[PDB]
Symmetry: C3
Subunit: 106 residues, 3 copies
């Protein structure tokens, strides 16, 4: 059979774990149907270093939030995140992806 | 100067309990490698998946595969995600070494 | 909110060579990077079993680097001799960002 694929976007949101609730609140408010969080990251930015812990998930961690969302949501989400990254460390990467079940993401 | 070749990349997010089923399917289809990211949390349509503080309840499998494999792989994963939690993301990527992946 | 085209590298390699990789990224003028640790995987020759990994040198990492298109060629050239002799892979993605100046 033909396995049909559909267009979606995937956001990768990298920021300090201390702001996880603000971020996931924003995602929920915008109507994102799910998200995945990768913790204990390291990284280098324009100003500071984040050393990933070698034993546990500490509170002052760097995290990445992965969120697959319909095209129509990208614009409003970035506007929502605009004041945040205007104020805080981190980045947003927008990807084009394909998924098998459009309804799962709306 | 440095030539690139087209490939597809799958991100397969699912419960750690099913790691072997997932990797068996990738292997059977002839996937030459994959990467498993542990220590995840997440929110789904019905529940929260809380990551451990130190084992891996939710995982993400990254698998770069030739285009010809995507169909067969999705067929393999269809009955699974029909019954179980998780998602598959298909990406277009580029790589430098085509034979490393087929 | 305008979006702009960029590339994103996913660089998977052994943790023992992390400094080599990050030095190369820094030297080439890459403005930032993010490292995902504690990875396991299956490679061309062997299995990298996470439970069998105990040192940071033996573990796999994934370095995520968002970079302008013009930087990709020279970066892959720098990594070319490394991956001839060492394990790991590089995935090149198309992405979009909002603050192009942040990445140059
Ligand atoms: N170009 C990039 N590619 C990948 N990750 C990045 C990039 N720039 C920043 N990051 C991630 O975001 C974090 C925040 O960096 P940045 O936004 O420059 O804040 P600061 O000014 O405090 O360093 C970095 O430590 C890194 O993990
Ligand atoms: N839109 C999404 N973006 C990113 N990750 C997602 C998305 N939807 C689901 N996931 C990941 O898959 C996991 C399972 O989701 P789901 O299959 O909806 O579980 P549930 O049984 O709770 O409905 C989530 O915890 C999340 O980590
Ligand atoms: N097709 C692939 N998709 C995703 N990750 C891969 C793939 N091939 C290799 N990798 C990642 O790179 C690691 C090293 O692979 P490889 O260079 O083939 O190792 P070796 O040749 O030393 O056995 C793997 O363990 C995996 O994490």
């Amino acid at each position: 059979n033909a396995i049909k694929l559909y267009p979606l976007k995937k956001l990768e949101i990298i920021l300090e774990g201390a702001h996880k609730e603000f971020a996931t609140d924003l995602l929920d408010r915008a109507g994102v149907k799910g998200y995945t969080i990768v913790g204990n990251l390291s990284g280098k930015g324009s100003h500071g270093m984040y050393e990933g812990h070698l034993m546990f998930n500490e509170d002052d961690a760097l995290i990445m939030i992965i969120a697959a969302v319909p095209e129509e949501l990208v614009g409003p989400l970035l506007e929502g995140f605009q004041p945040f990254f205007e104020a805080h460390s981190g980045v947003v990467f927008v990807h084009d992806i394909q998924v098998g079940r459009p309804i799962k993401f709306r």
